[PDB]
């Protein structure tokens, strides 16, 4: 769709490499470590999808 079709997504980063035939349903925000992240944040705490 022209400027649409958002229903298809993929994870850019993860806490660790996914195991064979694994599947992570959760979409929790990755932790940055250098700063607390409970809400949205910057460098590493972006929405993984």
């Amino acid at each position: 769709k022209v400027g649409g079709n958002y229903n298809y997504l993929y994870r850019l980063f993860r806490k660790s490499n996914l195991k064979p035939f694994e599947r992570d349903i959760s979409t929790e925000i990755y932790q940055a470590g250098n700063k607390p992240c409970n809400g949205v944040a910057g460098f590493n705490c972006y929405f993984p999808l």
Partner: antibody, heavy 123, light 107 residues
């Protein structure tokens, strides 16, 4: 569980700007996507635009760009809608609904709807 | 641009079968939905995939068709069917809805 609530009715002069919004209650602002759709008296539903609060992507209909502007935030968790240089024909009720096409292989349908915001224009 | 036309007003008694279609100029890739709505109220989604019903709506409501055609159907009318129904296209970004077919309980 997700549910939406809209603002109250409004009345203003032609040629002015009208501001209306809807609360992104239930679920989370990150796992939610909002889209505004117009329904005029004597007409079916009609699209105004879409906004994904977490992605920040927005678009409009080919006949309401500029005339209509869309914005959203997380501090308030709501989609902001502003219609400028509104005509007298802009007297209609605006809806704010959930955009399902945002995640997990769903499609561009509206599973949850708000109540409705009636905007009337008269002298 | 893509558009549609529902075909506008109906009247039926409890128990009979009714069918409605929303034609279009170009083949919609089965990306069509149908809503229930009282005139001037928040609609309720019934059909989102051409052959899959949403949670909460009974099997009494149904639909069929694919491509450049579709047909919404109620296997049997009931007094709760006093409302209008809207055919919606979502094949592309410029979302558009139908004019809305209205079926009235027939006395």
């Amino acid at each position: 569980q997700v549910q939406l609530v809209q603002s109250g009715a409004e009345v203003k002069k032609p040629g002015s700007s009208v501001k209306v919004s809807c609360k992104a209650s239930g679920g989370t602002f990150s796992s939610y996507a909002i889209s505004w759709v117009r329904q005029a008296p004597g007409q079916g539903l009609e699209w105004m635009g879409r906004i994904i609060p977490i992605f920040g992507t927005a678009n409009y209909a080919q006949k309401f760009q500029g005339r209509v502007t869309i914005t959203a935030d997380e501090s308030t968790s709501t989609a902001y809608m502003e219609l400028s240089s509104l005509r007298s024909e802009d007297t209609a009720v605006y809806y704010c609904a959930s955009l399902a096409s945002y995640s997990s292989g769903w499609e561009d349908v509206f599973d949850i709807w708000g109540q409705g915001t009636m905007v009337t224009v008269s002298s | 641009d893509i558009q549609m036309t529902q075909s506008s007003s109906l009247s039926a008694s409890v128990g009979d079968r009714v069918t409605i279609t929303c034609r279009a100029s170009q083949g919609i890739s089965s990306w069509l939905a149908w809503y229930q709505q009282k005139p001037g109220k928040a609609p309720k989604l019934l059909i989102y995939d051409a052959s899959n019903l949403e949670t909460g709506v009974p099997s009494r409501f149904s639909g069929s068709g694919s491509g450049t055609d579709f047909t919404f159907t109620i296997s049997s009318l009931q007094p709760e069917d006093i409302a209008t129904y809207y055919c919606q296209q979502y094949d592309n970004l410029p979302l558009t809805f139908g004019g809305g077919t209205k079926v009235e309980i027939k006395r």
